[PDB]
Design a binder for these strands. Structure first.
Ligand code: K
Ligand code: K
Ligand code: K
Ligand code: K
Ligand code: K
Ligand code: MG
Ligand code: MG
Ligand code: MG
Ligand code: MG
Ligand code: MG
Ligand code: MG
Ligand code: MG
Ligand code: MG
Ligand code: MG
Ligand code: MG
Ligand code: MG
Ligand code: MG
Ligand code: MG
Lengths: 167, 49, 204, 159, 271, 49
RNA sequence: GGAUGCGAUCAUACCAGCACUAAGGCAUCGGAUCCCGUCAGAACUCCGAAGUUAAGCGUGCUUGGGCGAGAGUAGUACAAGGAUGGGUGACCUCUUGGGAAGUCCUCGUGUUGCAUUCC
RNA sequence: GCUCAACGAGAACAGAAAUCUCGUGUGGAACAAAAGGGUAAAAGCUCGUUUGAUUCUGAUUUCCAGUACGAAUACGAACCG
RNA sequence: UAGCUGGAGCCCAACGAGUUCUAUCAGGUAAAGCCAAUGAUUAGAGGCCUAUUCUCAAACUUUAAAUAGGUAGGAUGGCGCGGCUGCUUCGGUGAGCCGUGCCAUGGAAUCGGGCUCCAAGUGGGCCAUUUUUGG
């Protein structure tokens, strides 16, 4: 259906950095997200003690941030440019979300010569009316005709960033 | 004790004592609980007189 | 060895299963419950005979295994290893205690036994009609391993199903029985209509 | 105390009924109780304040006091030779109004109306209940009669 | 899902499943002391839609809630207010209108005339010592009670209308968290629409293109930022003066229609 | 030497010799334990009758 | 024949998958000055009225799952009282009373209060 | 204010378990402890403010002789959060 | 120490009752269930999953008896009129109580006469039908 309310837009983009420890590495990791977003990043603690990774309970090991609006549009454009608009078929989840990775944030543009850091890009695609599942009063499911699935998300990437899905 | 009480309400305190009982649901279910201790039936005019 | 079965023959206690409150229980002697051709189609064996217990008593795991072996060996020899299916219909779930003076006499586990009642099927054999007489002989040999009184009864059902032979055949002609091993589920009139197949959807 | 705690052997008694847990309906909370009324006591295990002892579950008693969140209930307890009129306070969640006199309350109004008519007409009546008694004679027309017979015994169909 | 899941599932209360009622809060709002017997606890229900303000005086019975009096924002044009029917000012107007209506019903309006000029600070109508003022409890619902929430605009209107509502001033528009006191001047500005009027001035000058599209119905009605104080002042005075089937859905099929359709589908699969 | 621990044998027979005693039904049930509010108020109302 | 606010009962009301809806109301929706709010105007809060019934909400359908009522299971299982009843016993009869539960089969899928309002 | 265990599909390093995202999720988690009950806009988790874990005696429940102690409940008269 | 018993009385005669009936509450034992949660447990069938399948539970359970349990079945009730309250309500609004005038054919069956003091002995029990634990 060609309803004008049935247009896919980026709900939010989440930049994840997972260092695995705390100290100067985490602080320099956070500053990179500060530069690329303009908002204070939020740290994430560890939930289990795992000897192989060398992490204890309630230890700061990662950091992330949520961006929405034109800023997340430009960040996704530059991030997908690093891939040269070459995603993968597996990269798309079946709920209408996809992501990729960046090995080095220098390709995003900032010189940062803080150090050498990568990030996990994840992007949530949604249509209008998704508020019904997040508003406090009268919560409800968003309805299958208003949901974004893998077919729409893959089509959305093909025609917006001239991207090609690899197999 | 339950058999002892019911036979007191029917006034059957001794063996070979006899009484007249009028029939209703209340009395009949009283009689069913003391069935092994008693013999009864429907009397006729010759018996009553 | 162990005490004679007369010491535990009568059902005197409440059931005492192996559980979190009863630990250190030796394993049952009987571990196999189906012998012969177990993976035989439901349309192959229409003959069914039962060894039915006529007493309410305990039956040990030992007595169950001995009867299974004795019933099995005659059937394979006198009818063929391929001509029958024999099923033990009782599982030993009761734990018997032994107190090895009377101070603190609660006993430790001794063995496992089944609790059976009158009319309870002990053993079942499904074969073909030509071998039904041999089926009575193997059940007759098996009953000497059990305490108490047992009967051998010719079942009216087709094989191990719950269907009488007069009605299992009637359903088969109508195209209303789907064979799942030995169970022969009788499809009916419920569920999605698209779930059925051409010829397998019946009104009422 | 002395071998058994307050809620001993109440595992089934104080449990909630199946698929009837969670919220407590508003009807429980805005029923009105007055002194002299009859109420049944039924503990519910989700409300722990005002909880009566397990003896009073399933007993009916009179209301003798009313407070903000509870009512006073009078319940008979047999202690050896005699009955002790126990007086306990229970929160409204564990109490429901009793219907042990509902049939009596309506009957009393009806007996008043029936005796009112006898006053107008000048008659004398009873309006007193009588147990079910012997049925009067009656006739039944000639219809079909089905014959019932003992059935021959079948061994196979006994199970 | 599994049939075992369905067999053991217990459904919540219907208005909980709809996400419309906090049953913990409703219990504490309606539960009355037992030695008060049939005395009802009255509620001051204030609800905001996307376009309307609902105000109701409600008490609970067995058969359901019973309303003593109701008022709406959408009937405010009958008094003079046609725009901004969901802001802090119209919330104050709805609260004042409801309070005037209840006092009329109970013959208390003349005895308890509240503030007739929307003072802008904390108010409580003083009990007359012979007939106490009508007492209701504010029921906010599922909204978040923040400082300056419009529900406290309606609360302020009911207080000025003459109702006794147990409250505090910590949540009126104007309270300062770093000072623990209320600015009655900022509160009066909100009650008379100053925060909206400041926006119109902060839109008509620097971004006229945004000003036209944003306050379109204001412009279409010819309302300017300088008429708001007089517009809301007249409404309060006006309220205090005269406060008083073709079927379009299908029906359920019958047995003789449901079974008739089933015979056709079953043969279609069979053949 | 061990002995018996507990029994209710003969206890209910003992309880029924002077068969179970129901308390005397009295008009004007005692007001003790009623809430002191509405108790002093009832006292004040009676005093001012 | 509809809605909205607040409810009663709390699955005949739930769950799963499909289809459709006039008016109005709801809702989705636009924005971030002010109050408020977070990593994030996503949520919450405040101010609005360009667009839309796509979603939500409402209604209907399915030889649907569940839930509810029947019939049947079955006078079966069990169990109150009685027997100088049978039997070596296990147990089981009869007599005076009470009386269940799965499978299977059939049907159903809400009712309703106060206020305002749309046709 | 929020929702737990677990599962499904996803994102460089990073895999069975490191962090992020969406969907399902009647509790399959958690609630110091034994076990049993009980609890989902909570009784669980996170944050804000706090000391009612306060004063005065009475009454009732459990044990029961219907004594004491312990423990608990419903009021009253204060002072507070 | 309470209970069971005697003696002494005394106070009175509608009140009750080791019983049924009518109505209304409460229960998780027997049975049953697993083709329902927790746990145990045999076997194939079709594609780890799905639909079946044999057998189980004092410290499992959705359902769920019989027998026993509690309450009620009027004169110690009701209705007007008038008062009192320092309690309660927006409010004679309620909750009670006080006074006063009327009304109440006795409200199922059956049976029946029932507050205090002083004290004795007892506080080894045993047996039987049914239920039941250890062995
Ligand atoms: K034998
Ligand atoms: K114990
Ligand atoms: K059952
Ligand atoms: K099971
Ligand atoms: K003594
Ligand atoms: Mg034993
Ligand atoms: Mg002690
Ligand atoms: Mg709240
Ligand atoms: Mg001895
Ligand atoms: Mg002794
Ligand atoms: Mg927005
Ligand atoms: Mg729609
Ligand atoms: Mg159905
Ligand atoms: Mg616990
Ligand atoms: Mg405490
Ligand atoms: Mg049990
Ligand atoms: Mg059993
Ligand atoms: Mg003595």
């Amino acid at each position: 259906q060609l309803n004008p309310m049935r247009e896919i837009k980026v709900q939010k983009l989440v930049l994840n950095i997972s260092v695995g420890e705390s100290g100067d590495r985490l602080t320099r990791a956070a500053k990179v997200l500060e530069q690329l977003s303009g908002q204070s990043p939020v740290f994430s603690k560890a939930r289990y003690t795992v000897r192989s990774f060398g992490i204890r309970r309630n230890e700061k090991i990662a950091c992330y941030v949520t961006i929405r609006g034109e800023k997340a549009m430009q960040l996704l454009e530059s991030g997908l440019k690093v891939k040269e608009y070459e995603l993968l078929r597996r990269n798309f989840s079946d709920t209408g979300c996809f992501g990729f990775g960046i090995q080095e944030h220098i390709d995003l543009g900032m010189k940062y010569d803080t150090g050498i850091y990568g990030m996990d890009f994840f992007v949530v695609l949604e249509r209008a009316g998704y508020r019904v599942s997040r508003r406090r009063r009268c919560k409800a499911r968003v309805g299958i005709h208003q949901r974004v699935t893998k077919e729409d998300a893959m089509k959305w990437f093909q025609v917006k960033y001239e991207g090609v899905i690899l197999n | 004790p339950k058999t002892k009480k019911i036979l007191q309400l029917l006034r059957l305190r001794q063996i070979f004592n006899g009484v007249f009982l009028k029939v209703n649901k209340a009395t009949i279910n009283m009689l069913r609980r003391v069935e092994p201790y008693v013999a009864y039936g429907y009397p006729n005019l010759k018996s009553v007189r | 060895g162990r005490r004679p079965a007369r010491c535990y023959r009568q059902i005197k206690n409440k059931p005492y299963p192996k559980s979190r409150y009863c630990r250190g229980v030796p394993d049952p002697k009987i571990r196999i419950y189906d012998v012969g051709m177990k993976k035989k189609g439901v349309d192959e064996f229409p003959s069914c005979v039962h060894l039915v217990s006529w007493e309410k008593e305990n039956v040990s795991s030992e007595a169950l295994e001995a009867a299974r072996i004795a019933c099995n060996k005659y059937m394979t020899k006198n009818a063929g290893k391929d001509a029958f299916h024999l099923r033990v219909r009782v599982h030993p779930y009761h734990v018997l205690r032994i107190n090895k003076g009377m101070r603190g006499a609660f006993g430790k586990p001794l063995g496992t036994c089944a609790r059976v009642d009158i009319g309870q099927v002990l053993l079942s054999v499904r074969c073909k009609e030509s071998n039904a007489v041999h089926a009575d002989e193997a059940l007759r040999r098996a009953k000497f391993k059990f305490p108490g009184r047992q009967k051998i009864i010719r079942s009216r059902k087709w094989g191990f199903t719950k269907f009488n032979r007069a009605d299992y055949i009637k359903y088969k002609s109508e195209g209303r029985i789907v064979p799942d091993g030995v169970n022969a589920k009788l499809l009916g009139v419920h569920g999605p209509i698209a779930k059925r197949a051409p010829g397998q959807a019946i009104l009422a | 105390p002395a071998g058994h705690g307050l809620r001993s052997r109440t595992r089934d008694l104080f449990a909630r009924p199946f698929r009837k847990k969670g919220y407590i309906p508003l009807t429980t909370y805005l029923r009105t109780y007055k002194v002299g009324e009859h109420v049944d006591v039924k503990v519910n295990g989700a409300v722990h304040k005002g909880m009566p002892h397990k003896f009073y579950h399933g007993r009916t008693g009179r209301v003798w006091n009313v407070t903000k969140r509870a009512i006073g209930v009078e319940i008979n307890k047999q202690v050896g030779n005699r009955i002790i009129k126990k007086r306990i306070h229970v929160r409204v969640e564990h109490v429901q109004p009793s219907r042990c006199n509902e049939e009596f309350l309506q009957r009393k109004l009806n007996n008043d109306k029936l005796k009112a008519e006898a006053k107008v007409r000048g008659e004398v009546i009873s309006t007193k209940r009588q147990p079910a008694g012997p049925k009067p004679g009656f006739m039944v027309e000639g219809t079909t009669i089905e014959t019932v017979t003992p059935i021959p015994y079948d061994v196979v169909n006994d199970l | 899902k599994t049939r075992a899941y369905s067999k053991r599932f217990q459904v919540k209360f219907k208005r909980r499943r709809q996400g419309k009622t906090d049953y913990r809060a409703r219990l504490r709002l309606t539960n009355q002391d037992k030695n008060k017997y049939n005395t009802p606890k009255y509620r001051f229900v204030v609800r905001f839609t996307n376009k309307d303000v609902t105000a109701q005086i409600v008490y609970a019975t067995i058969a359901g809630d019973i309303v003593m009096a109701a008022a709406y924002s959408h009937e405010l044009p009958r008094y003079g207010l046609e725009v901004g029917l969901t802001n802090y000012a119209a919330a104050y107007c709805t609260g004042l209108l409801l309070a005037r209506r209840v006092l009329k019903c109970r013959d208390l309006d003349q005895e308890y005339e509240g503030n007739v000029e929307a003072t802008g600070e904390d108010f409580s109508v003083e009990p007359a010592d012979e007939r106490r003022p009508f007492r209701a409890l504010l029921d906010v619902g599922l909204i978040r009670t923040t400082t300056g929430n419009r529900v406290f605009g309606a609360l302020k209107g009911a207080l000025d209308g003459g109702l006794d509502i147990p409250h505090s001033d910590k949540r009126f528009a104007g309270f300062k968290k770093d000072e623990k006191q209320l600015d009655a001047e900022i509160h009066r500005k909100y009650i008379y629409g100053g925060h909206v009027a400041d926006y119109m001035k902060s839109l008509a000058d620097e971004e006229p293109e945004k000003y036209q599209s944003h306050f379109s119905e204001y412009i279409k009605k010819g309302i300017e930022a300088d008429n708001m104080e007089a517009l809301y002042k007249k409404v309060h005075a006006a309220i205090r003066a005269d406060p008083t089937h073709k079927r379009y859905n299908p029906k359920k099929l019958t047995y003789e229609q449901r079974k008739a359709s089933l015979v056709e589908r079953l043969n279609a699969l069979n053949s | 030497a061990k002995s018996k621990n507990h029994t209710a044998h003969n206890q209910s027979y003992k309880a029924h010799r002077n068969g179970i005693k129901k308390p005397k039904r009295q008009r004007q049930a005692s007001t003790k334990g009623m809430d002191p509010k509405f108790l002093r108020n009832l006292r004040y109302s009676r005093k001012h009758n």
